Amino acid sequence: QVAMAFDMRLGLCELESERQTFPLMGRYARSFAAHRLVLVGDAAHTIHPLAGQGVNLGFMDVAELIAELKRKDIGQH
Amino acid sequence: WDKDSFGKISFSGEEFGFSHLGHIIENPVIQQVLWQRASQLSDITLLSPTSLKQVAWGENEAFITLQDDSMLTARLVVGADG
Amino acid sequence: MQSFDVVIAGGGMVGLALACGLQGSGLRIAVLEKQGKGHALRVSAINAASECLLRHIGVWENLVAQRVSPYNDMQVWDKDSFGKISFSGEEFGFSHLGHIIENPVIQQVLWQRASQLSDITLLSPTSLKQVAWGENEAFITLQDDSMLTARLVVGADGADYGHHALVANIRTEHPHQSVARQAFHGDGILAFLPLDDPHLCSIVWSLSPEQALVMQSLPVEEFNRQVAMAFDMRLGLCELESERQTFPLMGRYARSFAAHRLVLVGDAAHTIHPLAGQGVNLGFMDVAELIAELKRKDIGQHLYLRRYERRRKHSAAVMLASMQGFRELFDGDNPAKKLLRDVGLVLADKLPGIKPTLVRQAMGLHDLPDW
């Protein structure tokens, strides 16, 4: 079934590992600011046009956050 | 087979002792062949190239006519292949 | 009998265009026709390519001096995605994209040319009683038992659909300013074709048969209201002047049929087109190419003909692909695309620059043979 859904692009297929599922907790969120609270989304588990790339959105959240934080009061919303 | 569900069924007559399920045959060959049989039969005559000018459906005869004004009659009429 | 090189069933715009044109060719032409000064109900939006056919056949000056309504500017939009594209030839140095011209004027004009030509005689009011398709002659006959023969026969202007068109003359609050306007709304399309009167348009409203029928039978104050909303009030309050007329759009999966000494050209005057009022242009282009091909072997044999058929069925697929393409373009002009434009991550979009391509299509200066 995996191979047909892939057009047989790589021929016959064989699962080695266990099969694991997890909800894609995108797509309408990734940030929450609050009075001395910052939330960054679980980008590791979020939808993206490019497979396996969600976490990049997180690494980019924090780079920008590193940038902004290294200056007033760090916490004020 | 189906490209969406990936469902598929395959089958053979050989599995049930048959040599063929059918034959692919060109239409011109089929028709020109049955045409040759047609005039190789005497209770059949072939009228061509002929188009119909009028048909007056009678109770006992067909009373059809031809463009070349050759009157024609028939018990029953049957149309096909168009 | 009388003997002709080509007889032409149903002599309307396109067949006569063929008559004047398929000439100075050595071919004798017969033409079978089986049958005011106010704004006609029926108008066609004649493009530059079509103009070059009519200017060539010497008739342009005529219906110009009659009544002609130049547009150089066009606007198309969609009421659902709010997408819209507008364009002009002036932007590329052209004075006009086309002309709105009344059908009766066009045809009565080409009719006058017809008998002002001696290799053309006109047979009317005449209907066919019998045609016996011979190997070398047409052997067709008339109801008045006048035998007739022809090398090749060609039918046009009449002789399956999806939508109907409601057409009518509509006075608008705001001047149309010589803009051909077209609005998509679901599976309704509503076009306003500008006329001589600075405040009058002839519309083409493509609707389902059931929708066209209801609109045609609506009381006028309701029609006035309803037409204007479907047009986004682009020209303000609306008032029907003329009668409301509907006719099936006999596109879209045909326009050509070749056969043993038979050529059929579609009733392009009644066929779907991306650009409202433009169907007939497809017909004028069918015949130009046919004039071109006919003026040479045997004129009638369905061998030197089916290659002509290829070209036309081809053109009809192109027109179909184009309507599909206008819809894709409008449904793609949405807010997510706007966001991506801004941020530079658009993969697929309106091309640089479709304005010039929209102009070459409206003018239809492609499609031409030259000559």
Side-chain angles (χ1 to χ4, degrees):
Chain A
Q1 195 84 28
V2 73
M4 302 293 179
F6 204 52
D7 273 321
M8 314 278 323
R9 190 54 56 95
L10 299 170
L12 299 171
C13 287
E14 297 200 314
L15 187 79
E16 292 200 2
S17 77
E18 238 64 42
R19 284 165 289 184
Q20 169 183 135
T21 78
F22 54 81
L24 283 183
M25 310 250 300
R27 339 72 145 167
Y28 317 137
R30 203 215 309 184
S31 179
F32 180 77
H35 186 297
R36 54 195 58 244
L37 172 67
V38 173
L39 239 203
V40 30
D42 188 12
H45 294 118
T46 189
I47 204 176
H48 194 290
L50 311 168
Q53 283 202 36
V55 66
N56 291 301
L57 305 168
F59 283 137
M60 291 302 88
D61 278 16
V62 285
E64 197 66 274
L65 174 61
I66 285 160
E68 188 64 33
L69 230 43
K70 290 189 296 184
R71 277 107 311 193
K72 194 222 196 159
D73 179 43
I74 238 197
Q76 300 175 26
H77 179 260
Chain B
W1 72 102
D2 182 283
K3 287 202 75 231
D4 290 320
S5 76
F6 310 131
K8 62 189 42 189
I9 57 97
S10 76
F11 54 102
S12 165
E14 114 115 273
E15 209 173 333
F16 311 106
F18 296 107
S19 31
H20 67 263
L21 284 168
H23 276 89
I24 313 297
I25 305 182
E26 308 168 290
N27 298 18
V29 182
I30 289 164
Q31 41 210 74
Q32 77 180 304
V33 155
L34 267 301
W35 190 83
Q36 117 236 142
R37 251 278 186 218
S39 52
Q40 242 222 334
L41 298 173
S42 37
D43 18 24
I44 327 296
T45 43
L46 294 75
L47 306 180
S48 73
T50 67
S51 50
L52 296 181
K53 179 195 169 323
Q54 151 165 344
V55 39
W57 294 90
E59 257 317 294
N60 317 336
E61 307 244 40
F63 293 133
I64 90 183
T65 71
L66 281 74
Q67 80 290 299
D68 62 287
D69 301 29
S70 162
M71 273 278 281
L72 205 46
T73 68
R75 274 165 100 193
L76 173 84
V77 159
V78 19
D81 312 291
Chain C
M1 334 81 32
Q2 319 180 25
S3 263
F4 300 99
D5 288 89
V6 182
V7 329
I8 298 169
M13 303 196 279
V14 184
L16 301 168
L18 175 61
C20 327
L22 189 69
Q23 215 283 59
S25 53
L27 277 12
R28 264 238 294 180
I29 285 80
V31 170
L32 297 338
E33 167 196 320
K34 344 272 190 52
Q35 281 185 27
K37 86 306 300 138
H39 298 284
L41 225 324
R42 294 295 296 114
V43 318
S44 92
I46 305 280
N47 67 27
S50 293
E51 163 181 347
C52 255
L53 182 67
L54 299 149
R55 285 192 109 110
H56 181 280
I57 59 188
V59 113
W60 188 251
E61 11 271 289
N62 278 23
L63 63 240
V64 160
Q66 181 71 0
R67 197 174 250 177
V68 278
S69 199
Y71 58 108
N72 196 22
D73 299 79
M74 208 156 163
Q75 283 167 21
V76 189
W77 72 102
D78 182 283
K79 287 202 75 231
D80 290 320
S81 76
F82 310 131
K84 62 189 42 189
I85 57 97
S86 76
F87 54 102
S88 165
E90 114 115 273
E91 209 173 333
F92 311 106
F94 296 107
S95 31
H96 67 263
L97 284 168
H99 276 89
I100 313 297
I101 305 182
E102 308 168 290
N103 298 18
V105 182
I106 289 164
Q107 41 210 74
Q108 77 180 304
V109 155
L110 267 301
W111 190 83
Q112 117 236 142
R113 251 278 186 218
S115 52
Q116 242 222 334
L117 298 173
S118 37
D119 18 24
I120 327 296
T121 43
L122 294 75
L123 306 180
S124 73
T126 68
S127 50
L128 296 181
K129 179 195 169 323
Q130 151 165 344
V131 39
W133 294 90
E135 257 317 294
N136 317 336
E137 307 244 40
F139 293 133
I140 90 183
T141 71
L142 281 74
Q143 80 290 299
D144 62 287
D145 301 29
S146 162
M147 273 278 281
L148 205 46
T149 68
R151 274 165 100 193
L152 173 84
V153 159
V154 19
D157 312 291
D160 188 83
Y161 61 89
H163 294 272
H164 287 191
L166 183 155
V167 294
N169 294 330
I170 309 270
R171 190 158 293 282
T172 61
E173 190 173 5
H174 302 123
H176 47 60
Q177 298 178 337
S178 297
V179 184
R181 284 176 183 80
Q182 203 158 285
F184 290 84
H185 187 201
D187 70 317
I189 141 166
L190 179 56
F192 277 53
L193 275 15
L195 305 172
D196 259 29
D197 200 286
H199 288 254
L200 207 76
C201 291
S202 156
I203 73 177
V204 177
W205 205 350
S206 319
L207 290 174
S208 80
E210 182 170 331
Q211 293 155 41
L213 190 40
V214 172
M215 293 306 189
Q216 196 189 25
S217 288
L218 268 182
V220 326
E221 94 158 287
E222 193 56 57
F223 177 89
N224 293 346
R225 194 247 182 238
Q226 195 84 28
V227 73
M229 302 293 179
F231 204 52
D232 273 321
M233 314 278 323
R234 190 54 56 95
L235 299 170
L237 299 171
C238 287
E239 297 200 314
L240 187 79
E241 292 200 2
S242 77
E243 238 64 42
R244 284 165 289 184
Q245 169 183 135
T246 78
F247 54 81
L249 283 183
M250 310 250 300
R252 339 72 145 167
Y253 317 137
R255 203 215 309 184
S256 179
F257 180 77
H260 186 297
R261 54 195 58 244
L262 172 67
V263 173
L264 239 203
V265 30
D267 188 12
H270 294 118
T271 189
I272 204 176
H273 194 290
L275 311 168
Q278 283 202 36
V280 66
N281 291 301
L282 305 168
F284 283 137
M285 291 302 88
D286 278 16
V287 285
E289 197 66 274
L290 174 61
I291 285 160
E293 188 64 33
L294 230 43
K295 290 189 296 184
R296 277 107 311 193
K297 194 222 196 159
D298 179 43
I299 238 197
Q301 300 175 26
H302 179 260
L303 308 147
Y304 329 83
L305 279 177
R306 35 76 81 246
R307 11 115 306 117
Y308 161 80
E309 183 163 30
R310 191 156 180 165
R311 300 206 166 273
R312 242 94 297 289
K313 274 221 242 181
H314 181 273
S315 174
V318 176
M319 289 323 289
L320 242 21
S322 184
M323 246 300 150
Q324 171 165 347
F326 263 108
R327 289 314 202 103
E328 275 167 9
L329 165 83
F330 294 126
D331 310 347
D333 210 44
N334 51 47
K337 186 149 309 307
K338 273 146 223 160
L339 228 186
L340 284 198
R341 274 167 167 141
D342 203 279
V343 90
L345 294 170
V346 182
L347 277 51
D349 215 348
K350 62 199 294 186
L351 258 21
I354 65 156
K355 298 196 178 208
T357 117
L358 246 0
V359 171
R360 143 168 196 269
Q361 187 177 358
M363 298 182 62
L365 71 225
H366 73 291
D367 263 88
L368 214 131
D370 240 350
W371 210 110

